[PDB]
Amino acid sequence: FKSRLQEYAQKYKLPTPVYEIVKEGPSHKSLFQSTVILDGVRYNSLPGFFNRKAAEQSAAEVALRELAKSS
């Protein structure tokens, strides 16, 4: 959520988005999942990521897309 979406939440007077990170699977074949929670609304990233940054970006994309939908 950090960046544009963060500034948006601030302008929307919404509670600071909560970032949670979930890591599962083998130590050599691990998968990352990012969850961004904003005002009770949960934004889950896509599965099948092998990088924390990749999952985080996906989570942000979901939040942004859902924002455009609500826009």
UniProtKB/Swiss-Prot annotation:
Gene: DRB1
Subcellular location(s) of the protein: Nucleus; Nucleus speckle
Written domain comment of the UniProt record: The dsRNA binding domains (dsRBDs) 1 and 2 are sufficient for the function in miRNA precursors processing and mature miRNA generation.
Deletion consequences: Short plant, delayed flowering, leaf hyponasty, reduced fertility, decreased rate of root growth, altered root gravitropic response, decreased sensitivity to auxin and cytokinin and hypersensitivity to abscisic acid (ABA). Reduction of several miRNA accumulation.
Residue range from the parent sequence: 16 to 86 of 419
Transmembrane segments: none
Top-level taxon: Eukaryota
Note: Plants overexpressing HYL1 show decreased stability of transcripts targeted by miRNAs.
Tissues/organs with expression: Expressed in rosette and cauline leaves, stems, roots, flowers and siliques.
Subunit (UniProt): Homodimer. Heterodimer with DRB2, DRB4 or DRB5. Interacts with SE and DCL1. Interacts with RCF3, RS40 and RS41.
Species of origin: Arabidopsis thaliana
Start and end residues of each DRBM domain: 1-69
Function summary: Double-stranded RNA-binding protein involved in RNA-mediated post-transcriptional gene silencing (PTGS). Functions in the microRNAs (miRNAs) biogenesis by assisting DICER-LIKE 1 (DCL1) in the accurate processing from primary miRNAs (pri-miRNAs) to miRNAs in the nucleus. Forms a complex with SERRATE (SE) and DCL1 to promote accurate processing of pri-miRNAs by DCL1. Binds and assist DCL1 for accurate processing of precursor miRNAs (pre-miRNA).
Coiled coil: none
Annotated protein name in UniProt: Double-stranded RNA-binding protein 1
Signals that turn on the gene: By abscisic acid (ABA).
